[PDB]
Design a protein around this nucleic acid. Structure first.
Lengths: 173, 205, 78, 159, 190
RNA sequence: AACGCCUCUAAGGUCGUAUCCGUGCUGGACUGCAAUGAUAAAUAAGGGGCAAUUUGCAUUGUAUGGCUUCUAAACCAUUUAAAGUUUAUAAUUUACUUUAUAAACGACAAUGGAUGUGAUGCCAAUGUAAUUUGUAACAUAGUAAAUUGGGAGGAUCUUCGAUCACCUGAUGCCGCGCUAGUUACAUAUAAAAGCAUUAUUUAAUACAAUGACAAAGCCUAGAAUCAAUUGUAAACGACUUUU
RNA sequence: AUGUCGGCUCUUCCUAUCAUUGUGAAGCAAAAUUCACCAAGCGUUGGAUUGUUCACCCAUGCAAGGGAACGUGAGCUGGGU
RNA sequence: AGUCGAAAUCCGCUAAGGAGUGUGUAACAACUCACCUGCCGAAGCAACUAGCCCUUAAAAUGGAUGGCGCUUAAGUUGUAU
RNA sequence: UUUAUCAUAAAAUAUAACUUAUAGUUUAUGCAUUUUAACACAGAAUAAAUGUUAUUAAUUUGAUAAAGUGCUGAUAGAUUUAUAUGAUUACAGUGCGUUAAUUUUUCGGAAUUAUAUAAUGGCAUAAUUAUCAUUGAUUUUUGUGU
């Protein structure tokens, strides 16, 4: 998916010896609105007693990133597990929204580390302002303004005529 | 003239690779081809000058152990090392797989009216369209020489003959194409000839 | 592309191929009968670039894989 | 440096690939090695995500702050008189084949194409009008100088 | 990482009239003109409309944008090659047999023998634009000439390889032909 | 050099082996290929070419409703994914050669085709079809052709290379037939009720391919193969020869 | 009913290389020799007893390396078995 | 004697000179280090961890991702339709 | 969100003076001017951009279900001797026999109620069953009025 964001609260069904259980909350980025409903149990089973089904999942809430037109960059903390070197991890990826900032982060983490999705827990997402990105492949884009003639195309290759007549001559300056 | 799509397709090979040309022209050739591929001496291959030599020395090592005019018939001219990618792709043990290799000629030394009939381009085949920078690449007309084609220079005694002969022909048509627009000054006041096309093509016409 | 070929829904499909004798008089509009042709009808777009499968009256005689069959406009619309 | 096509803010661009196929939009900021936040306020599209690959670039860099709202871009695009000078670009006259040669109607196409007969009907009579130093005169031009008397003098006949 | 941008624009002296036909650096000067080709080495340069010459690699990994100083290094030698030239020196040290190093013109490659007073005339030809003359007023020294820095040392390397000992411990017999100085022919004294 | 230094590599130019590839030497798409020689009996009569032809009937193929044609004339002339290219001006040059300046172009909508890139055909109809139509006036433009010798030209498994396109000596006089725009006129032709029609889709034209028949002139005057030999060959055949 | 052990004759391929071509290492002065990379191109034997593979000799050698379809009996031999 | 190796052991001197760093230096020494400052002025450096390539890694008939082949992939990975 | 307003912030860059450097420049090594793609946060003004709060224009984004929302284009396929031993029937649609005007076309059409309901919701109150809760709200049985 495009990794939309849901916040989620659990219940721990209201058993009479102590009613009104404390209702802990997560922040789940997830490929679907159907799948975070059984990912929340995977996060919750690290801390409290609380096993499905001794608890309910009161409202998942899709939340709608607030500032899409601005280009604010985020850092993510991270827990990858490769072959046996499970770890802590900090990265960032400069994206438009937060929901695009986790699809890309998965599909970099699966791209250089192989790091399947069953070993990643998005433990924290912070909106980093500036000046604390380590991240040499990012913060060279902080430098507004920039001349940047990195002339690319899609390279749609090339197009329709599979026996053309006109010599496709990229550079065109 | 006519054929099933045209009478022919003749493909220049500067940067038109071996692999992503064959794999197009093979699939084309079971659909009405009548094609031919020329100027074969500067096709390209991945790896390099010494590496994809060693692609061609596994299959030159492969004799046929018992009667070696029995099996593998290698071919040293760089025409029919094109063809070595167009034999795998057509299942030549049917009497239909062989119903394209009588359509298909492959040339190297551009004679024989595939020198005046107009050549074309196929896009994905271009070395300038699927190979990035700094990844080196071998060249067929200066590899197959050093796996033994005896005419790497015997083309050039005639290739420069035609490349000198093509100089004056473009100069034969240089001022003659220029004579057209010189004659086009005498025609813009024919009766009222031009507004039908300045409304139609009419940008530079 | 598959937006092109969907204009070839529902057309007939017809293919001529030559043979020796006549064996039939010219009565429905004139035929000296040297040409012989089975018939049919295309249906639906199949390939993600425009290859569009097609059914015939009998069965496409098997040696035609590289014969110049046709599609006429009947029937058509705007 | 050969004065290359500089993808810099805020140059206007004409995209080809995505949903801007027919839109004139301008760059807000570069995002990463592939992504650009692009916008055209006068054409009917706001800012959104876009690849650096989907679009070609024009050659008209117009100044903006790099954290500009659209309204001053809405101000400055009209100030920079692009809409005047867009359709005078000599190969954006060539852009009018998507603005006139689209759909190329079949209720005038004879007059769009029997005039190419009419141009060619007077073309070749202006051919064999050689200047190639013959001159003069290449007999049997004695029986063609009367034909060529109708080109030069002209009055009256040859000869 | 695909880092973005790195350039270099070296200062150009007033005497020269240098140009690039898009990939090929040419530079003319006092001793003539030397132009070596870079149609394939994957770099981007253009003289920024001045005497000077600027270079650029857009979006390289790390082997790729190593190239920016290299072509720069490959042409700052070419400054010195056309206005000064190049010269190396072979010292020709032996132990017992005096080596016989002769040259001539033109026929200015080498003619040597007597190593170790042996029978085979070793002989090494040179590169064009390069001449090899023995040094006068100095015992068994040599002078290289030329303008291509990647040909004068190689011509010196072609007389570095030949000659050599065979089969023996080279730490006993240290005889050989060696380069001593890296010199130009005009700058600055000569 | 990135790694201010160095450093045989980070891309780059080179020294090198009985190895491996090639000449070199032996068989050769068993019958692939190249030019090249001869080309019949008889000369009464025939046979065989020249023929692609002049001359009909008869058949195929191809554009099938006159055209779902084309055209066999270009994009460097070592080589490049930022790289650049193309035309100018001036120097230079055999060369759009080299040089310098100027833009033009901006891997834009375009281009990946009608630049139909010796600028296509989709036609002369001035009733233009499964035939042709014609006569004038007006203007501007005004082409296509055919007869007589000397020379520069043109090959890379060739759709005619013992000839061939170009210029000229020069014969001659088509002035046979040109085309466009405006307006008038003389017509002929053209309708398969089939009206929800096509169907084993004619086919003429024209193109070429033809072959056959009596039609059409010309050109033409041998080899092979064994048998019989011989002996440089030999299980036989083949192979070298001979009258 | 797959004729099962050796030698003879005989094509072959194989690198984990004996020695020959090109190097590099060393407690490599030289001569001599050792190491190690690349390298299958021609080479790797004549004899005493045994029925042999090995074993062990004698000698040539400026020098004698290993291996494959149990290579192989309508090719033999039949000495053992 | 500052110096194969040192029990020791401070300091004086001074920005910086330690019973001393030194070429299998047997004495003094010669002698440069450490160190401080000149010089240049934005990033450098130590081990650590783990994706692919990389070494590893050698078979006998000549031939195997299944062939043709690919290399800002037709490739090893997470994936959109 | 966006756009349009709000008051300030606090101004990080972009329009907006002139330096210096940089080379090519003129005149006699410097200046005169030219490219500053060196461009001195080098200057103010300005965007009060950016920063803060709040409201917003056809009150503005798009996702995810729901309604014949409304077609327009197609594909292949069509059982049945229901007596060759048992509705060919019933739903609906058509043209004939009250009405009154409103309206429109005026050539039709067109449009009008009361005629009777259990009414079924809207609302109001009575009333109760019952409820996480309970200001309450979900209701249940209803009852009545509108």
């Amino acid at each position: 998916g495009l990794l939309k964001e849901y916040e989620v609260v659990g219940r721990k069904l209201p058993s009479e010896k102590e009613p009104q259980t404390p209702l802990y909350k997560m922040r789940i980025f997830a490929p679907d609105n159907i799948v975070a409903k059984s990912r929340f149990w995977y996060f919750l089973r690290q801390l409290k007693k609380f096993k499905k089904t001794t608890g309910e999942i009161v409202s998942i809430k899709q939340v709608y990133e607030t500032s899409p037109v601005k280009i604010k960059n985020f850092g993510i903390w991270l827990r990858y597990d490769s072959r046996s070197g499970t770890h802590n991890m900090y990265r960032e990826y400069r994206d438009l929204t937060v929901g695009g900032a986790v699809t890309q982060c998965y599909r970099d983490m699966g791209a250089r580390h192989r790091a399947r999705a069953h070993s990643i827990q998005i433990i924290k997402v912070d909106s980093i302002p500036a000046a604390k990105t380590r991240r040499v492949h990012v913060k060279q884009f902080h430098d507004s303004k920039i001349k940047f003639p990195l002339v690319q195309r899609v390279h749609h290759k090339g197009n329709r005529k599979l026996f053309s007549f006109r010599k496709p001559r990229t550079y065109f300056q | 003239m006519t054929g099933l799509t045209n009478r022919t397709v003749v493909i220049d090979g500067r940067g038109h690779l071996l692999g992503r040309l064959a794999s197009v022209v093979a699939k084309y050739l079971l659909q009405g081809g009548k094609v031919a591929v020329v100027r074969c001496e500067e096709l390209n291959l991945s790896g390099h000058f010494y590496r994809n030599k060693i692609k061609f020395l596994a299959y030159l090592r492969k004799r046929c152990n018992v009667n070696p005019a029995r099996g593998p018939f290698h071919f040293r001219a760089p025409s029919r090392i094109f063809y070595k990618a167009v034999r795998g792709m057509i299942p030549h043990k049917t009497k239909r797989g062989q119903a394209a290799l009588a359509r298909l000629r492959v040339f190297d030394g551009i004679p024989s009216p595939y020198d005046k009939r107009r050549r074309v381009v196929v896009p994905i085949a271009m070395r300038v369209l699927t190979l990035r920078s700094d990844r080196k690449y071998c060249q067929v007309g200066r590899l197959s020489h050093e796996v033994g084609w005896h005419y790497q220079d015997v083309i050039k005694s005639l290739e420069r003959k035609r490349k000198a002969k093509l100089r004056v022909t473009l100069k034969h048509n240089r001022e003659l194409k220029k004579l057209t627009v010189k004659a086009r000054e005498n025609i813009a006041k024919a009766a009222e000839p031009f507004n039908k096309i300045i409304k139609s093509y009419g940008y530079e016409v | 592309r598959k937006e092109h070929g969907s204009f070839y829904v529902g057309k007939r499909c017809v293919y001529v191929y030559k043979a020796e004798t006549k064996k039939c008089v010219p009565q429905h509009p004139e035929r000296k009968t040297r040409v012989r042709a089975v018939w049919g009808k295309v249906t639906r777009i199949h390939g993600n670039t425009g290859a569009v499968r097609a059914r015939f009256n009998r069965n496409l005689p098997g040696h035609a894989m590289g014969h110049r069959i046709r599609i006429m406009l009947y029937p058509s619309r705007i | 440096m050969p004065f290359e096509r500089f993808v810099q803010t805020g140059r206007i661009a004409k995209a080809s690939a995505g949903p801007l196929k027919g839109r004139l939009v301008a760059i807000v900021d570069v995002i990463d090695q592939n992504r650009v936040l692009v916008d055209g306020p006068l054409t009917g599209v706001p800012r959104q995500e876009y690849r650096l690959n989907n679009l070609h670039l024009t050659k008209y860099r117009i100044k903006f702050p790099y954290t500009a709202p659209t309204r001053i871009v809405r101000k400055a695009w009209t100030e920079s008189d692009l809409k005047a000078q867009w359709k005078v670009s000599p190969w954006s006259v060539k852009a009018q084949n998507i603005c006139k040669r689209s759909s190329l109607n079949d209720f005038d196409r004879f007059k769009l194409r029997y005039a190419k007969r009419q141009r060619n009907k007077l073309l070749t009579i202006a051919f064999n009008t050689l200047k190639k130093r013959t001159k003069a005169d290449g007999t049997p031009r004695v029986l063609k100088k009367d034909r060529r008397e109708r080109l030069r003098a002209e009055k009256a006949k040859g000869g | 990482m695909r880092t973005i941008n790195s350039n270099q624009c070296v200062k150009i002296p007033k005497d020269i009239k240098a140009s690039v036909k898009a990939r090929v650096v040419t530079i003319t000067g006092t001793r003539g003109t030397l132009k070596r080709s870079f149609k394939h080495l994957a770099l981007d340069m253009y003289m920024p409309d001045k005497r000077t010459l600027k270079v650029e690699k857009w979006f390289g990994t790390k082997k790729e944008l190593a190239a920016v100083r290299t072509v720069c290094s490959h042409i700052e030698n070419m400054i010195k090659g056309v206005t000064f030239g190049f010269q190396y020196k072979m010292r020709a040290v032996y132990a017992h047999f005096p080596i016989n190093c002769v040259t001539s013109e033109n026929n200015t490659v080498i003619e040597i023998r007597n190593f170790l007073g042996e029978k085979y005339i070793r002989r090494v030809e040179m590169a064009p634009g390069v001449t090899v003359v023995n040094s006068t007023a100095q015992k068994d020294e040599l002078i290289v000439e030329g303008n291509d820095i990647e040909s004068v040392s190689g011509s010196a390397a072609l007389i570095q390889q030949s000659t050599t000992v065979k089969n023996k411990d080279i730490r006993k017999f240290l005889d050989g032909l060696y380069v001593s100085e890296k010199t130009t022919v005009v700058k600055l004294e000569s």
